[PDB]
Amino acid sequence: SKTVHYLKDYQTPAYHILKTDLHFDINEPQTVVKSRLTVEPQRVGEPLVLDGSAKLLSVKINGAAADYVLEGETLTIAGVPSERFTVEVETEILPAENKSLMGLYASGGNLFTQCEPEGFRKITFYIDRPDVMSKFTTTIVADKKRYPVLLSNGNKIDGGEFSDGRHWVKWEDPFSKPSYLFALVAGDLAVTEDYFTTMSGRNVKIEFYTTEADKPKVGFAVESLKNAMKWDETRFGLEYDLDIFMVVAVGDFNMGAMENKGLNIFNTKFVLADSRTATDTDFEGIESVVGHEYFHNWTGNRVTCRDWFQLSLKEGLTVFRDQEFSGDRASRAVRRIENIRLLRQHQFPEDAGPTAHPVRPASYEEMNNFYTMTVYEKGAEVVRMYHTLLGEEGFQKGMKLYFQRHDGQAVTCDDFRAAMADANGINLDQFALWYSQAGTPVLEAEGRLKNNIFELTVKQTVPPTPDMTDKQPMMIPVKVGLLNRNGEAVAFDYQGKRATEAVLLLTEAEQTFLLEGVTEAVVPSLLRGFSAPVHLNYPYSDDDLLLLLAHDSDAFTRWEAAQTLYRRAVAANLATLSDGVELPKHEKLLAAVEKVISDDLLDNAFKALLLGVPSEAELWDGAENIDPLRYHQAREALLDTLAVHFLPKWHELNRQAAKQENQSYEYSPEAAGWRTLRNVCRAFVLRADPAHIETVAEKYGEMAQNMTHEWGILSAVNGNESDTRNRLLAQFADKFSDDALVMDKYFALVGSSRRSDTLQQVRTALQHPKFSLENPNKARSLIGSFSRNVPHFHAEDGSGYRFIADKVIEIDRFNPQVAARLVQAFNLCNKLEPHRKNLVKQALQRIRAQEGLSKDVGEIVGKILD
Numbered sequence: 001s002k003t004v005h006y007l008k009d010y011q012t013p014a015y016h017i018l019k020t021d022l023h024f025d026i027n028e029p030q031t032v033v034k035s036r037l038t039v040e041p042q043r044v045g046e047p048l049v050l051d052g053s054a055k056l057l058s059v060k061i062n063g064a065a066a067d068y069v070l071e072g073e074t075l076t077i078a079g080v081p082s083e084r085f086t087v088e089v090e091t092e093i094l095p096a097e098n099k100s101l102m103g104l105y106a107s108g109g110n111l112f113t114q115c116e117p118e119g120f121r122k123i124t125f126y127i128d129r130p131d132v133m134s135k136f137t138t139t140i141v142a143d144k145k146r147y148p149v150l151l152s153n154g155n156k157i158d159g160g161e162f163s164d165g166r167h168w169v170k171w172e173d174p175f176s177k178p179s180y181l182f183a184l185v186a187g188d189l190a191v192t193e194d195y196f197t198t199m200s201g202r203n204v205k206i207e208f209y210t211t212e213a214d215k216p217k218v219g220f221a222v223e224s225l226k227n228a229m230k231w232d233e234t235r236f237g238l239e240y241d242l243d244i245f246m247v248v249a250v251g252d253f254n255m256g257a258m259e260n261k262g263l264n265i266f267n268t269k270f271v272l273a274d275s276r277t278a279t280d281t282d283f284e285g286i287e288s289v290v291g292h293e294y295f296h297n298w299t300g301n302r303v304t305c306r307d308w309f310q311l312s313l314k315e316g317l318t319v320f321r322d323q324e325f326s327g328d329r330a331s332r333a334v335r336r337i338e339n340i341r342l343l344r345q346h347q348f349p350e351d352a353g354p355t356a357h358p359v360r361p362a363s364y365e366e367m368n369n370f371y372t373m374t375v376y377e378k379g380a381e382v383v384r385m386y387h388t389l390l391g392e393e394g395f396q397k398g399m400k401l402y403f404q405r406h407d408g409q410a411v412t413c414d415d416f417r418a419a420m421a422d423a424n425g426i427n428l429d430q431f432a433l434w435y436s437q438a439g440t441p442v443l444e445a446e447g448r449l450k451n452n453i454f455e456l457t458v459k460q461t462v463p464p465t466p467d468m469t470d471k472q473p474m475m476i477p478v479k480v481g482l483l484n485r486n487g488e489a490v491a492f493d494y495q496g497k498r499a500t501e502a503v504l505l506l507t508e509a510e511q512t513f514l515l516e517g518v519t520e521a522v523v524p525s526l527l528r529g530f531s532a533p534v535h536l537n538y539p540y541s542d543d544d545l546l547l548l549l550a551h552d553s554d555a556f557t558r559w560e561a562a563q564t565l566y567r568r569a570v571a572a573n574l575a576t577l578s579d580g581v582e583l584p585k586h587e588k589l590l591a592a593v594e595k596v597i598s599d600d601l602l603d604n605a606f607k608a609l610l611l612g613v614p615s616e617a618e619l620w621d622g623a624e625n626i627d628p629l630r631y632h633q634a635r636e637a638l639l640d641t642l643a644v645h646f647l648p649k650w651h652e653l654n655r656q657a658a659k660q661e662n663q664s665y666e667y668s669p670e671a672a673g674w675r676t677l678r679n680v681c682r683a684f685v686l687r688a689d690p691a692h693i694e695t696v697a698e699k700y701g702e703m704a705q706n707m708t709h710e711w712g713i714l715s716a717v718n719g720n721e722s723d724t725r726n727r728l729l730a731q732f733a734d735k736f737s738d739d740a741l742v743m744d745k746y747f748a749l750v751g752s753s754r755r756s757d758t759l760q761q762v763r764t765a766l767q768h769p770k771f772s773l774e775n776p777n778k779a780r781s782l783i784g785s786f787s788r789n790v791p792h793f794h795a796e797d798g799s800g801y802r803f804i805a806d807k808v809i810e811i812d813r814f815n816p817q818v819a820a821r822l823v824q825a826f827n828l829c830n831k832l833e834p835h836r837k838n839l840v841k842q843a844l845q846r847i848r849a850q851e852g853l854s855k856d857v858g859e860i861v862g863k864i865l866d
């Protein structure tokens, strides 16, 4: 009797809602919501079924008290007119009691909403599904001194005052929308005003709302929005469609931001920065996410989702758009590698684990569990493959046809694919499998130069996943090139064209590609630009990898050669540590890294990436009976070797980076590149010479010229067993006690430390006056960081597992979304060595045994355990 939602069961709704008129009467403590729905029968005579979980005060049909039944979270009216009719629902909400941060809730003494995916039903009774689109008008009444700012979607068309100190506003959004895009804000908030003029000459008023204290940190977000608006015009030909665009910052928020039409609501983390309190990465994040939410105005809002299985239709596409925006801003190659690295570090384990799902899932119990790395980041890689197959011009032809066909509609992934296919006159039927088949495809490649042909044989395979065993061959673009003995590009003939690069389109289980007219011995460069989201196996020698790393023209393949050398070095460490003998010499790797360190032609941020070692999760990919501490030990040994071996050169590279930064402490991509390299150097220095922390501490103020430097130094020393580490962290918390986003950084350092005493420091931090478990940013920073802290989470005595399971249980009582994300710390369960596996299963069984456990957490626990 447990409810599962299946894509195969989709049916159009029995009723449409043409008009949604809302009235909010905000009081202390309760808010009363009145709705009036103009309902249009589609299947005449069916019962009207409304979703809702708010306290119900009354229901009318055509103005008279309705005969209805309330059952669970539904309201059913059996006796429906056969003609257009209205329904009026009155509900009552206590927003200060709402710690789920879905629906209408309080934060910092103000009121905010979050409705995606199914939060609107926590406000009123509604047909709360995204293929039902309605024109909203929203009236808000509140005390003026307490709630001077009253916002909802669209245009402000009326307002006024009452003699008792109350005031009101009325907002009309002329664009039909699904309920998940509804927003309301009521509060005492400061505003920052700006504008943008569209290419048709229309001014758009821009308003950012923040606390009074936070206002000085919102400027970069405003600038980023104007950049995003211009970019969507120049790159996609897309113009904004209202004369007002509002953004509201909120400190209590389950995700990063939300694209509500004309009234975006952002986590403070993705809108507030200055150089004193935010890192360069934080600035890049604001640019990315402000872009993302604005880009949803077309890819999400103007064209929306038929059903929640199609989430990647808007999210994969909009992530692709924010990636392209950021790459067009600056540093495209480095940013592309950053994106690839995040996918392989976080999404690949998802696809290999118990919660693996297709980009377009076929079923779900709780839709909030499917806002995933797969739907978003793999979703974006799928959209990018259209770009790779079609080119920018062809891709834009597809976009044009997509909007022509589907503006104002709620559609499917299939419709996006068809627009791409039809606009370009190409068959993309096989491409559909990128949406329906889960798992990381594995390509096995072999190469031979015989006659004057380089014959590249490639096989593909996709593993069964828990949802599906049968996996058919997919359409996989493999971008390639060839290097001669001196690492020079070598031209070849393919499909009657002589070039140095080609896209090989693998569509069968096994294919041979003939690169003809090759006049010299070659080493192939494969999967350039990470041209498909796959695992590629090709037999490279260490010397082949050094060649690629030294001379290849593609950023990804150069970086992947280094990643491979690191991976092989860790594997060699695993072996020696296991045999109880001396560590390997790693002579070739050390020679390779020396070259990278000493190369002054390398981009600084690219050099920093070449000096990064794959994470433990990457290293144990594909393994069984995993002891995570053995992998941690082997990785730490490699980092120690790199730190100590090159210690003088790490200091020298640091000095060179400092000189080039040139005291330009504000955010810019140029200065940030130097600081990124500097922070890599700091990490290695303080590994090799932990005593250097006292030298750092002595001159801390001189060093602390922005938060990128403070964060970089505190990160570097965070695992140091000196008392000074603890003192510097305490001083950081004191300095920045009043800045909640910097206190998030403090708590992340507490939870992530490799020091031996981290569990007890974490437990003390739970009682820190600036910590709140009910704040998702804080919970994520402290507890989330601890759950990803390999030696502590995976402690042999099980203390890490017991602690995280305790917190899943505690958090689930008020915020199931946060708890269900946290409990995925346990996803490695069935791949662990027996002792830890036993303890993880005990932890999961204890979570399962909780009375009233959320559907959110229960769905995840079932996938891991059952």
Ligand SMILES: N[C@@H](CCc1ccccc1)P(=O)(O)C[C@@H](Cc1ccccc1)C(=O)O
Residues within 6 Å of the ligand: 114, 116, 117, 254, 255, 256, 257, 258, 259, 288, 289, 292, 293, 296, 315, 319, 322, 371, 376
């Ligand atoms: N549609 C929004 C998520 C909806 C939601 C559901 C429940 C609770 C709160 C909000 P989004 O995709 O635009 C926000 C997204 C922004 C993002 C994602 C990937 C890259 C860059 C930006 C981040 O939170 O992952």
Ligand SMILES: [Zn+2]
Residues within 6 Å of the ligand: 292, 296, 314, 315, 318
């Ligand atoms: Zn999004």
